[PDB]
Amino acid sequence: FVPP
Amino acid sequence: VFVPPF
Amino acid sequence: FVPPF
Amino acid sequence: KVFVPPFKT
Amino acid sequence: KVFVPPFKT
Amino acid sequence: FVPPF
Amino acid sequence: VFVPPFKT
Amino acid sequence: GFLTAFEYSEKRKMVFHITTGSQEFDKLLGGGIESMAITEAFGEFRTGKTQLSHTLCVTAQLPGAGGYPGGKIIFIDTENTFRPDRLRDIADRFNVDHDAVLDNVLYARAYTSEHQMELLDYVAAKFHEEAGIFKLLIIDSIMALFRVDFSGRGELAERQQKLAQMLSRLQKISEEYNVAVFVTNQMTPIGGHILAHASTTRISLRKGRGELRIAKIYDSPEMPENEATFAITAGGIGDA
Amino acid sequence: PGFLTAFEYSEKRKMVFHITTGSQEFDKLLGGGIESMAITEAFGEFRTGKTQLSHTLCVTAQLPGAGGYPGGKIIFIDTENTFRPDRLRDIADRFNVDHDAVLDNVLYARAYTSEHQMELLDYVAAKFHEEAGIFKLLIIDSIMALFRVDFSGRGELAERQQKLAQMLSRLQKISEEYNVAVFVTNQMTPIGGHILAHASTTRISLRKGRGELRIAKIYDSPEMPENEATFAITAGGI
Amino acid sequence: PGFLTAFEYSEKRKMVFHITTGSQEFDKLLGGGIESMAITEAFGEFRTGKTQLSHTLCVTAQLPGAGGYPGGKIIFIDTENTFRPDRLRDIADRFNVDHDAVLDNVLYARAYTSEHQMELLDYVAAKFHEEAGIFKLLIIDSIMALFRVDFSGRGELAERQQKLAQMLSRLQKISEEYNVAVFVTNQMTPIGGHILAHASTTRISLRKGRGELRIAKIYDSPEMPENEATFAITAGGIGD
Amino acid sequence: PGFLTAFEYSEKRKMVFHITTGSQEFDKLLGGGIESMAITEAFGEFRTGKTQLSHTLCVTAQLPGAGGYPGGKIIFIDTENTFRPDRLRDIADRFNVDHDAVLDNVLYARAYTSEHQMELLDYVAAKFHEEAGIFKLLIIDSIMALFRVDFSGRGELAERQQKLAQMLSRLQKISEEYNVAVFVTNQMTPIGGHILAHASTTRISLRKGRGELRIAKIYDSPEMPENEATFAITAGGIG
Amino acid sequence: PGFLTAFEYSEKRKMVFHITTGSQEFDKLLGGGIESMAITEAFGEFRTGKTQLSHTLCVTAQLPGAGGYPGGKIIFIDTENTFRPDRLRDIADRFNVDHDAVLDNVLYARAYTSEHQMELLDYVAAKFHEEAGIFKLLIIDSIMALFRVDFSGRGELAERQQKLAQMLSRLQKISEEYNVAVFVTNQMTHILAHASTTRISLRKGRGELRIAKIYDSPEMPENEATFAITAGGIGD
Amino acid sequence: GFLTAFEYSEKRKMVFHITTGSQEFDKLLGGGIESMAITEAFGEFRTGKTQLSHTLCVTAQLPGAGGYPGGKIIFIDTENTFRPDRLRDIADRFNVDHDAVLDNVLYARAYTSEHQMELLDYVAAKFHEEAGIFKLLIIDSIMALFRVDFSGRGELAERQQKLAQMLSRLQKISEEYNVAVFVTNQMTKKPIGGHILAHASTTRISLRKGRGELRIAKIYDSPEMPENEATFAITAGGIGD
Amino acid sequence: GFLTAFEYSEKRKMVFHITTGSQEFDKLLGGGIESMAITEAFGEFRTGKTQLSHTLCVTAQLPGAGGYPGGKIIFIDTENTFRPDRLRDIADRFNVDHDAVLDNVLYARAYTSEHQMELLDYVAAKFHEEAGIFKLLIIDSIMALFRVDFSGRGELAERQQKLAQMLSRLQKISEEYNVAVFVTNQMTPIGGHILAHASTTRISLRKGRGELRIAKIYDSPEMPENEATFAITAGGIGD
Amino acid sequence: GFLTAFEYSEKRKMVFHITTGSQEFDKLLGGGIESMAITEAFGEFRTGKTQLSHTLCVTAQLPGAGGYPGGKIIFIDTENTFRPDRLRDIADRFNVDHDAVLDNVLYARAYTSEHQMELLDYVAAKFHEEAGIFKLLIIDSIMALFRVDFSGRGELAERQQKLAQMLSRLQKISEEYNVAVFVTNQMTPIGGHILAHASTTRISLRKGRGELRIAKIYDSPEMPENEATFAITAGGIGD
């Protein structure tokens, strides 16, 4: 997962 | 014809 | 139709 | 066959 | 198909 | 039976 | 046999 | 299945009335028991239902007003009340032969509602055999046997359906063959919407002063014109 | 098809007869006695005369009587266990007729269930049909005790009413087809409702009078003297 | 499929006509008279004008009227046994038109059961289709007496309501497809509930006024004079 | 098919007998005693005499009596667990008859269910048929306690009533075919309703009198002295 | 499997449009007008403006409007027998557009039963499916009169509720799948409360003015709007 | 299927009584717990039901009045209340060996009404193995499990049928094999069971608390009279005067 | 189906909280919306349910306390109230890109209770595709459609059965895949014992003075610790 | 199928008690939670049920009075309340290793009543695998899931039947394998006659002064001896  | 009583 | 008369 | 009543006094 | 608006007077 | 004496 | 927990 | 209004007018021009034997009762009925219609009479015991039935059994054979020629009568009896000797007394009153009167009345007992409907189918057949011979159908009484055959609730649906079917058949018989239908009924008037709708004229009978009786239009306002006084004698229904 | 002229019906009714009850006043009340082509129902409390009336009719139906009545046989269906030939012996003694002849002209059967009662009535219908005019009286003492018994819980009331109506319509047809008088007894709570009221052509209430006298009245009739009669009960019957 | 444009529907409604009641105020109350492509229901007690209105419309529907109405024929379904051509005779006399022409242009049928009434309405639909523009008015006196008759006991109401809805939807379709006015009479207890209220496009309560006057009102409308009209009953029918 | 002449029925009923209750007034009340070709039902509260009457009849049915009664044997079906031969010993002592003969002439069975009770009655019918005229009295103490037990919840009432009617019609047929008296006891709430009221030919209400006396009455009869009788209870039974 | 990202749903909602009521204040009350991808319900008493509003929207839905709204077609289901093209002629006169063109862009059907109404709505769905972007508005006047009519006796309410819920779920799916505004009228006396995205109470004001209010909303001025009724329809 | 009255008299001559441990209670019962019969004891908590059960568990093994020779006991436990240590204390009171007492009592738990009926069928089999060995059958309690397994209405018919069947089996067991049947029951006051249990039980005893530590036994549904009541005490040695 | 308490401890050590955006609210919740649990929020109109749902739709993607790395969200909408523009404003507040926020939320409308349950089965399948991707499941609202589809009486049995089935499935989803399940609900709180038991945390929301809102633990004593004040802004829930 | 009273005495001599952590509570219970029996604890929120469950989870593993050697525990959780960290704190209090405590407790969640019964069948199997290892079965709570799965009336008969079946299985498990069964229950205590009969000991828990709690024997007379005071700490139930 890549934070926004 | 109907016959009336008499 | 014919009207009455 | 006949019934016999009980009796002795 | 494109919508034609009504327009006369 | 034998009583539990 | 069960082993009781013990560290004390 | 449709007639023009002209054809129906021509058909209604043949409507006749059968005198009840009482002038005031006749005025109440517009001339008497009307053909192409059902007239229902209900009341308590000894109010005149049986006397009226027998009187009509005699008067339907007599020439009358409006060119009425007289004719024959069919009587279906569910109460075991029909007595030819009453007809003998009424014939004596009207100075007509006994055997001729008795020969012009066809009679049947009904013991069940199914039997009553079968009898009415035979009546329809007889009327059809040659129209214009019979002028009056009497049913004394109209639905005692339906009360009997469907007394427990849960069968009420079937009772109402059979009753409606019988009454629609009666209506069709009266209007197709131009006969007056006169029926008697008990009180508790029973029947509900079905019998109220099926009957074209409804008459309540009650006791008057002394030996007189009173006939009234059911569900009508409390007014004298909707009532008539008549008397009962060994000679049948008559004027006071 | 299925219809008679009023003349034919008059001819049929000319053969109607009455069976004397043994009481002149009761007979006047009934127009001569127990009428044929009809059901007569008698109901009342205990010791009002139902059993005495049944037995008296069991004897009087065998005797020549008014209006050319020649006498005949009787059928008695007993649901109450009350029929007693010795009463018939005493009544025969009163009327000066032989005991054994009276007893030979009465056919008798107990009914233990409503289905049994209806089967018995079917046999009665067959017997009456074998030769009309032989039997003059059918007695059912009592008419629907067994229907009360066999359908006491509600929910089966519909079937009770249907069976009762069927039996009573059969009884009517038997009485009117074979020109017999039908006499039945009944209990009070009178039971039956519309069905039994309609089925019975004549209904009689029995009650106790002064001293040992009894009173018979037309049920549901106005309170007037002509609709009532006083009678007495003896070893010789009504 | 099953849809029209608003233009086509406008073209369809342009053929809508009104049949005069014979009373100016009544017509104003109705917007010209009895409207085509719609059901008008009249209910009230006895002697309020339902039958007089039916017979008057039976005559006025044959007369040329406002808006180019040319007149036409009428179908009358009678569940109450109340239709009397002689009233049409008197009404035609009032309007100075020949008796036999009026009587020949009205088709008439009695309905004795609700199933029979629906069969009759199917025949009526077929006849109206046979050639449009001949018939202008269908009268049903009364609309649901036979439905009350055939299902009087409780528990059968589902089928009663279903049959009633089916009949009334068929009546709507007849009125709108064949461009005829449908006039029906009804009893009070008005019976029917939501079904008949929705099916009828116009509902009129008829009641007695002063002396011989009658009152017509829009049912379920506010208590206001504009929603009411006074009219009179004469041998010539409904009038001012 | 199914009918008798009145003469044949008279001849059959001439063989009807009565069994003394041990009490003169009770016997007068019953027209001589417990009648054959009939069911007699006795109901009442606790200690009113039902069990004492049952046992007394168990003894008196064996003794020659009025109207040519020759005596005979007894069958006793017990649903209440109340039958006690020792009472019969005391009553026999009172009537000066041998104990063992009395005890040998009574057949006894417990019923634990209504189905069991009906099976027992079928065996009773078989026994009576084995040789008629031997047995004169059938006692059921009590008649429908087990029907109350086996059908206590409602919804099964139809089957209870049907079984009860069937049993009572069988009892009637047994009493009338073999000319035996049937005596049954019953509880009060009397239970059963129309079925048991119709099935029983004689119904007796038992209640307590002054001191140690008891009172027997004809059920559903007018409030009059002739329809009632006073009797006493002793170690020697009903008197 | 039937799922979109919030981004795809944002892209879908960017196509939402509003159809003017003809009244500026009413539009402000509604945030621009009758909103697509939603059901708007109007209820009130007689002569409160339901039919006038239905006909006005019948005309305004065909006109170019704010936010790039290009106009489109309308479907009108009539259970009350109240649709009157002459009102549309008067409103077109007000808005200076040709009558016949306006009348050609409205499809119309009467519904006589609730089952018939649901079948008609299935045909509406099929019609929208034929070509997207053509139709913008579905009007149902009225939404559930026929459900009251067909199930009036007690004991049948369960089936009534089921059919109503089914119809309203179908109407929601139609509105959101085909991006149309659904406007329905209703009468006064959970299913309908939930199904409607916007609920408007209409009532009479002073003289000839009418008032629109957000149902079940606080008694505050912003939740109310005044509008007028003329031969030309709804206006200021 | 029939016996003569003489044979039945001979059968009833074998009836015995088992002392309760209390003289007044015994007088109330005509000598004690009677054979060829069911005796039911019901009451509230701590009224004596369990103490009476255990005391009878001991007294049934002791020679007693009327020629009672003593014998063995079967105990069906639906309440999880049987405690041998009470029997040890009561044996101490009556001066009898603990292990002998415990060897003469057969014990089983019942967890369902069907299980209870199966257990009673095994009891019938055991009694049949050799008659005259066992004199007392205890069921503590008689229909708790029927309340449990049929608590909702609509199954009441089956509950009543199973209960009646079990109680008729108990009667037949008691009368065929000449054993006393003692059962305990709960209250709801009136005892549960209705007509079925009232009829099935030959003797019914209501137990209630008296003054201080005393208890009172009464004949159920009997008139309010002293003779129909008895006072007794509870000790570590069981039921006593 | 059994684990040791040690394995369950190891499982619970991975439990996380998703911040609500409000410090006081988080303290009330013990850190925020808890994983392996259902949290139910109920209250009246404009009390914060939709604002809270959207705020959590954003905050669940943000790295947070206790090593929370952020993850994806599933949103089931029964009310037609989801508005991405609110997520845009909230992202602006939290300084994160709009499109990235919108790409990490999967969204579905539910129109019937059967549809809602099918969607939840698809949610389970989606979690199964790859664990650790999704951290939060939102259902707004939990049983509006069950009220809609079964409004008449007599159908309650099936309604309760379906509701219990759905809620047990939700519990299993939350605990098997270590996700927080947040659902909104209406008041009349509805659901009865079924919903009371199924929800691990229940929050009542109400209006405070001016624009503030108050969250409280339902059925808890009247004490300040069980209450928290928070504010609503265009940026979502806050202090 | 029968044992002698001697054999049963020998079997009961193996009965043990597990200390609650409170001396007064233990005295109230006759030593503690008793084997071959079901003990039910019911009360309002924050009365001690969960603290008691966890304390027993620890104390059941410790050698104790009367030669109790300690053993393993099975915990079925219908409420989502089991927290190993409480066991860590209680172990700290009792000076025993955390991981050993956590390894000797087997744990399972139940989500439906059918699931709960299946779990109890697995428990029976596990106990059978090697007897004498497990001493305590905890069910927190006993019938919440039966309330959930049968909330509408008309299905109450089946609920009661399933409940009775489960409780009879619990009794047989406790008595066959000599384990103590401890269950928690809600109030409205629910269950009726079935649960009242099935439980050998019933405890009502209520709040005392300050932080103290009070345990009482349900349906017992109003007397002090039938009551006990105890305290709740991070270390569990205590004095």
PDB file of C-alpha atoms in Angstrom, chain I residues 32-159:
ATOM      1  CA  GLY I  32    -107.615 -36.093  15.558  1.00  0.00           C
ATOM      2  CA  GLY I  33    -104.326 -37.473  16.839  1.00  0.00           C
ATOM      3  CA  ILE I  34    -100.862 -38.254  15.528  1.00  0.00           C
ATOM      4  CA  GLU I  35    -101.009 -37.401  11.835  1.00  0.00           C
ATOM      5  CA  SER I  36     -99.606 -39.459   8.984  1.00  0.00           C
ATOM      6  CA  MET I  37     -97.348 -37.983   6.296  1.00  0.00           C
ATOM      7  CA  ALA I  38     -95.779 -35.918   9.080  1.00  0.00           C
ATOM      8  CA  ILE I  39     -93.334 -35.887  11.982  1.00  0.00           C
ATOM      9  CA  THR I  40     -94.648 -35.103  15.464  1.00  0.00           C
ATOM     10  CA  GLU I  41     -92.022 -34.264  18.088  1.00  0.00           C
ATOM     11  CA  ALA I  42     -92.670 -34.410  21.830  1.00  0.00           C
ATOM     12  CA  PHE I  43     -90.256 -32.776  24.256  1.00  0.00           C
ATOM     13  CA  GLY I  44     -90.284 -31.950  27.941  1.00  0.00           C
ATOM     14  CA  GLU I  45     -88.735 -32.540  31.328  1.00  0.00           C
ATOM     15  CA  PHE I  46     -88.594 -35.791  33.283  1.00  0.00           C
ATOM     16  CA  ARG I  47     -91.916 -37.520  34.032  1.00  0.00           C
ATOM     17  CA  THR I  48     -93.910 -35.359  31.614  1.00  0.00           C
ATOM     18  CA  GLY I  49     -95.369 -38.197  29.545  1.00  0.00           C
ATOM     19  CA  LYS I  50     -93.005 -38.872  26.637  1.00  0.00           C
ATOM     20  CA  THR I  51     -92.536 -42.567  27.423  1.00  0.00           C
ATOM     21  CA  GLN I  52     -96.189 -43.021  28.391  1.00  0.00           C
ATOM     22  CA  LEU I  53     -97.227 -41.352  25.134  1.00  0.00           C
ATOM     23  CA  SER I  54     -94.865 -43.542  23.090  1.00  0.00           C
ATOM     24  CA  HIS I  55     -96.258 -46.725  24.651  1.00  0.00           C
ATOM     25  CA  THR I  56     -99.874 -45.591  24.429  1.00  0.00           C
ATOM     26  CA  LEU I  57     -99.411 -44.898  20.726  1.00  0.00           C
ATOM     27  CA  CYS I  58     -97.735 -48.328  20.470  1.00  0.00           C
ATOM     28  CA  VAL I  59    -101.070 -49.786  21.549  1.00  0.00           C
ATOM     29  CA  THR I  60    -103.599 -47.399  19.971  1.00  0.00           C
ATOM     30  CA  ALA I  61    -101.986 -47.659  16.517  1.00  0.00           C
ATOM     31  CA  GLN I  62    -103.146 -51.296  16.423  1.00  0.00           C
ATOM     32  CA  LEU I  63    -106.810 -50.469  17.088  1.00  0.00           C
ATOM     33  CA  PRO I  64    -109.494 -49.592  14.537  1.00  0.00           C
ATOM     34  CA  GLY I  65    -110.392 -45.951  14.983  1.00  0.00           C
ATOM     35  CA  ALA I  66    -112.160 -42.842  13.739  1.00  0.00           C
ATOM     36  CA  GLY I  67    -112.185 -41.885  10.077  1.00  0.00           C
ATOM     37  CA  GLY I  68    -111.957 -45.497   8.945  1.00  0.00           C
ATOM     38  CA  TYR I  69    -108.552 -46.143  10.513  1.00  0.00           C
ATOM     39  CA  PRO I  70    -108.046 -49.942  10.370  1.00  0.00           C
ATOM     40  CA  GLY I  71    -105.028 -50.283  12.664  1.00  0.00           C
ATOM     41  CA  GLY I  72    -101.592 -51.559  11.790  1.00  0.00           C
ATOM     42  CA  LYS I  73     -98.049 -52.208  12.956  1.00  0.00           C
ATOM     43  CA  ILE I  74     -95.491 -49.981  14.680  1.00  0.00           C
ATOM     44  CA  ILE I  75     -91.700 -49.656  14.547  1.00  0.00           C
ATOM     45  CA  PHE I  76     -89.960 -48.445  17.715  1.00  0.00           C
ATOM     46  CA  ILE I  77     -86.320 -47.330  17.744  1.00  0.00           C
ATOM     47  CA  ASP I  78     -85.111 -46.876  21.318  1.00  0.00           C
ATOM     48  CA  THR I  79     -82.071 -44.727  22.092  1.00  0.00           C
ATOM     49  CA  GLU I  80     -82.943 -44.165  25.774  1.00  0.00           C
ATOM     50  CA  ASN I  81     -83.391 -47.775  27.038  1.00  0.00           C
ATOM     51  CA  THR I  82     -86.938 -46.940  28.166  1.00  0.00           C
ATOM     52  CA  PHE I  83     -89.200 -49.289  26.174  1.00  0.00           C
ATOM     53  CA  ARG I  84     -91.073 -51.654  28.513  1.00  0.00           C
ATOM     54  CA  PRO I  85     -93.531 -54.228  27.086  1.00  0.00           C
ATOM     55  CA  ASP I  86     -95.245 -54.514  30.488  1.00  0.00           C
ATOM     56  CA  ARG I  87     -96.602 -51.003  30.000  1.00  0.00           C
ATOM     57  CA  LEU I  88     -98.086 -52.292  26.745  1.00  0.00           C
ATOM     58  CA  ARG I  89     -99.646 -55.172  28.693  1.00  0.00           C
ATOM     59  CA  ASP I  90    -101.319 -52.756  31.109  1.00  0.00           C
ATOM     60  CA  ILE I  91    -102.552 -50.523  28.282  1.00  0.00           C
ATOM     61  CA  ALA I  92    -103.879 -53.540  26.369  1.00  0.00           C
ATOM     62  CA  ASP I  93    -105.704 -54.580  29.542  1.00  0.00           C
ATOM     63  CA  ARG I  94    -107.254 -51.109  29.722  1.00  0.00           C
ATOM     64  CA  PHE I  95    -108.373 -51.327  26.076  1.00  0.00           C
ATOM     65  CA  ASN I  96    -109.483 -54.991  26.425  1.00  0.00           C
ATOM     66  CA  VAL I  97    -107.171 -56.475  23.776  1.00  0.00           C
ATOM     67  CA  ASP I  98    -104.865 -59.485  23.900  1.00  0.00           C
ATOM     68  CA  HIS I  99    -101.316 -58.945  25.156  1.00  0.00           C
ATOM     69  CA  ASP I 100     -99.483 -61.233  22.723  1.00  0.00           C
ATOM     70  CA  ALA I 101    -101.246 -59.771  19.681  1.00  0.00           C
ATOM     71  CA  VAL I 102    -100.230 -56.252  20.739  1.00  0.00           C
ATOM     72  CA  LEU I 103     -96.650 -57.399  21.333  1.00  0.00           C
ATOM     73  CA  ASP I 104     -96.446 -59.213  17.980  1.00  0.00           C
ATOM     74  CA  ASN I 105     -97.430 -56.105  15.973  1.00  0.00           C
ATOM     75  CA  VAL I 106     -94.570 -53.931  17.301  1.00  0.00           C
ATOM     76  CA  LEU I 107     -91.086 -54.252  15.812  1.00  0.00           C
ATOM     77  CA  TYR I 108     -88.360 -52.951  18.100  1.00  0.00           C
ATOM     78  CA  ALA I 109     -84.688 -52.036  17.825  1.00  0.00           C
ATOM     79  CA  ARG I 110     -82.136 -50.289  20.020  1.00  0.00           C
ATOM     80  CA  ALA I 111     -79.828 -47.699  18.468  1.00  0.00           C
ATOM     81  CA  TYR I 112     -76.416 -47.248  20.098  1.00  0.00           C
ATOM     82  CA  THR I 113     -74.876 -44.675  17.707  1.00  0.00           C
ATOM     83  CA  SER I 114     -76.159 -42.084  15.260  1.00  0.00           C
ATOM     84  CA  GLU I 115     -74.754 -44.108  12.354  1.00  0.00           C
ATOM     85  CA  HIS I 116     -76.556 -47.150  13.761  1.00  0.00           C
ATOM     86  CA  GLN I 117     -79.750 -45.101  14.076  1.00  0.00           C
ATOM     87  CA  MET I 118     -79.513 -44.049  10.424  1.00  0.00           C
ATOM     88  CA  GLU I 119     -78.855 -47.620   9.281  1.00  0.00           C
ATOM     89  CA  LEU I 120     -81.902 -48.707  11.294  1.00  0.00           C
ATOM     90  CA  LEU I 121     -83.952 -45.991   9.604  1.00  0.00           C
ATOM     91  CA  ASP I 122     -82.786 -47.253   6.208  1.00  0.00           C
ATOM     92  CA  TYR I 123     -84.024 -50.720   7.166  1.00  0.00           C
ATOM     93  CA  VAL I 124     -87.277 -49.108   8.318  1.00  0.00           C
ATOM     94  CA  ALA I 125     -87.624 -47.360   4.948  1.00  0.00           C
ATOM     95  CA  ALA I 126     -87.081 -50.704   3.219  1.00  0.00           C
ATOM     96  CA  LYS I 127     -89.681 -52.424   5.398  1.00  0.00           C
ATOM     97  CA  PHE I 128     -92.276 -49.683   4.851  1.00  0.00           C
ATOM     98  CA  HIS I 129     -91.583 -49.899   1.121  1.00  0.00           C
ATOM     99  CA  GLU I 130     -92.042 -53.685   1.044  1.00  0.00           C
ATOM    100  CA  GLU I 131     -95.800 -53.091   1.360  1.00  0.00           C
ATOM    101  CA  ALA I 132     -97.309 -49.694   2.092  1.00  0.00           C
ATOM    102  CA  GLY I 133    -100.304 -49.437   4.403  1.00  0.00           C
ATOM    103  CA  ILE I 134     -99.135 -52.231   6.715  1.00  0.00           C
ATOM    104  CA  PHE I 135     -97.204 -50.026   9.148  1.00  0.00           C
ATOM    105  CA  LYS I 136     -98.825 -46.845  10.442  1.00  0.00           C
ATOM    106  CA  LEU I 137     -96.426 -45.511  13.097  1.00  0.00           C
ATOM    107  CA  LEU I 138     -92.661 -45.090  13.442  1.00  0.00           C
ATOM    108  CA  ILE I 139     -91.430 -44.108  16.917  1.00  0.00           C
ATOM    109  CA  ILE I 140     -87.935 -42.760  17.608  1.00  0.00           C
ATOM    110  CA  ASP I 141     -87.268 -42.301  21.342  1.00  0.00           C
ATOM    111  CA  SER I 142     -85.206 -40.252  21.070  1.00  0.00           C
ATOM    112  CA  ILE I 143     -84.442 -38.498  17.810  1.00  0.00           C
ATOM    113  CA  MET I 144     -80.988 -36.986  18.359  1.00  0.00           C
ATOM    114  CA  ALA I 145     -79.593 -38.028  21.751  1.00  0.00           C
ATOM    115  CA  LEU I 146     -77.029 -40.102  19.854  1.00  0.00           C
ATOM    116  CA  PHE I 147     -76.091 -37.112  17.688  1.00  0.00           C
ATOM    117  CA  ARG I 148     -75.460 -35.124  20.867  1.00  0.00           C
ATOM    118  CA  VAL I 149     -73.330 -38.047  22.066  1.00  0.00           C
ATOM    119  CA  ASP I 150     -71.318 -38.638  18.887  1.00  0.00           C
ATOM    120  CA  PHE I 151     -70.638 -34.913  18.268  1.00  0.00           C
ATOM    121  CA  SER I 152     -70.294 -33.300  21.703  1.00  0.00           C
ATOM    122  CA  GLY I 153     -67.138 -31.265  21.069  1.00  0.00           C
ATOM    123  CA  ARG I 154     -67.313 -28.191  18.874  1.00  0.00           C
ATOM    124  CA  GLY I 155     -65.532 -28.199  15.531  1.00  0.00           C
ATOM    125  CA  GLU I 156     -67.481 -31.297  14.479  1.00  0.00           C
ATOM    126  CA  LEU I 157     -70.774 -29.388  14.767  1.00  0.00           C
ATOM    127  CA  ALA I 158     -70.943 -28.943  10.981  1.00  0.00           C
ATOM    128  CA  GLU I 159     -70.932 -32.715  10.456  1.00  0.00           C
TER     129      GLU I 159
END
